[PDB]
Design a protein around this ligand. Sequence first.
Ligand SMILES: Cc1ncc(COP(=O)(O)O)c(/C=N/Nc2ccccc2)c1O
Ligand SMILES: Cc1ncc(COP(=O)(O)O)c(/C=N/Nc2ccccc2)c1O
Lengths: 282, 282
Amino acid sequence: HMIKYYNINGQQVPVENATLHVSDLSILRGYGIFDYFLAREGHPLFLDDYLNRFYRSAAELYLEIPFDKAELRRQIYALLQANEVREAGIILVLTGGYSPDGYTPVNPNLLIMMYDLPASAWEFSAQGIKIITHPFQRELPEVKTINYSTGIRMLKTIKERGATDLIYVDQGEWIRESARSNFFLVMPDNTIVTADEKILWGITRRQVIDAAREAGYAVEERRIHITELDQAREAFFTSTIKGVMAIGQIDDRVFGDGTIGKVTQELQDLFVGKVKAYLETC
Amino acid sequence: HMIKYYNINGQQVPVENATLHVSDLSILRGYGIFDYFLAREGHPLFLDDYLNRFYRSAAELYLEIPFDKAELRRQIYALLQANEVREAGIILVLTGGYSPDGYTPVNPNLLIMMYDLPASAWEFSAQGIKIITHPFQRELPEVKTINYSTGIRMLKTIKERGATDLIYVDQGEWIRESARSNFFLVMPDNTIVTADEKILWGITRRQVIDAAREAGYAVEERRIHITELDQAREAFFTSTIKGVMAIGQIDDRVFGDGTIGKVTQELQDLFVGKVKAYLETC
Ligand SMILES: Cc1ncc(COP(=O)(O)O)c(/C=N/Nc2ccccc2)c1O
Ligand SMILES: Cc1ncc(COP(=O)(O)O)c(/C=N/Nc2ccccc2)c1O
């Protein structure tokens, strides 16, 4: 394949003509929401859950999506067909729109953009990644806003310090999530622990919590103190692109020998199970 | 007049052709900085101070402005001349640019946009405005990021509650600033008080602090507890558009009779003094 079209406000447009006027509130004021999901075998994965979150995020910024969910789903499928692709990354963006005063939102601009399935998608490396803690709390964390400035600004420091990612700790006390991932601990008794509050409710997080409970693991959704890293055997990320990704080091702590923990490897397999089961309903 | 041109990346472009490709990081990730200043008698006001802040904000997001300050100043003057206007609002935007991966910043896109001088600019109403307190702390507050989502999202609640603005209170404890203004108290002994930390260092704030000290007022730059509203005689905003704007009510508290306090009215006159003195050096 090669990506020929995006969709702006219900119209398929060649990628090279896909533009917004500079008065768009995303450009001037960072006012917008988005979602991102993969397609496999021609089907966006868990699509109803992603679209439900997109409509919920939009409601929290008082931005009306111009199409109902069934019509949005049609445009997404139509865009897969127009690009002639079965495997893809799909972005949805809803901006504050072409504001008259550079502040008051009006009709949003809706973007559907499409890319190759990321090469790294569900790599499931046996080698855990290395991350740093960073004291920070995302704004409006339950809403998928376009606001990624702390995450992006931290790229230089992350790379400088020999890490590939970070875990946000609210006031250096409470473990939350990374800029683009949910965060989980596995304790020595095999209890899975993940933040309940002041985080984005990831679609991957949902599927992994459900799979873990179906397998008979105890999954605690609660606040996690920074000191509880020392009680954990395993640490992992969930996200649309990562699936389940082993974390082998946080700051000066190696999780086991740095390689993927047993419950993490099991959750990887069960995640792939959830994906296969989804694609069987399509 | 009528505005004919903006400037994108050093090129004058008709306003109707001023667009960014949808891959721009401001659109996808809210990654960018900006500045906004007025021009009078053909001269952007306090321009060196605004441009210094623009370069400082850019450095904090690791975004390189493609032009040095003298060249940027030339483009701004050239754009005033091309639009044939002496009175204007001028926006500068520096985005994270056309990122290959929808996350890593590259060469920024630089926008210079121009509008009529706001009709409300320095209205200096004798009637104080009505504002609400809102518990919130801006991200990277010393940097003028494009991230205005809390401020914009609050518009509905502000208007619903019969207010026209808000004052952010960090953890409902520490008075900071509004979404677009610095915040000052005047005490009964005529001491002026304003936040020192975790706020944007406004150009208007600077000029008003300097003018107050020149007049022999005590100006304390310190943390302000929410309970100190009850010790204050006067409250006002500073911003590029407002100049000095009387606040007549915060929540259930009327400042005096709701009309502009004596020190606030004096600071308005001294602000206009600073403006006239600036325009005499041009
Ligand atoms: C703050 C935050 N927390 C968790 C997730 C994981 O959610 P899910 O399992 O539903 O993917 C994401 C995902 N971002 N995805 C993303 C962000 C930027 C660019 C590309 C993708 C996120 O932004
Ligand atoms: C957070 C914050 N705090 C203070 C000021 C006042 O700074 P100055 O006296 O230098 O104007 C501004 C100004 N925004 N200006 C602005 C924002 C959005 C749209 C238009 C103008 C601000 O954003």
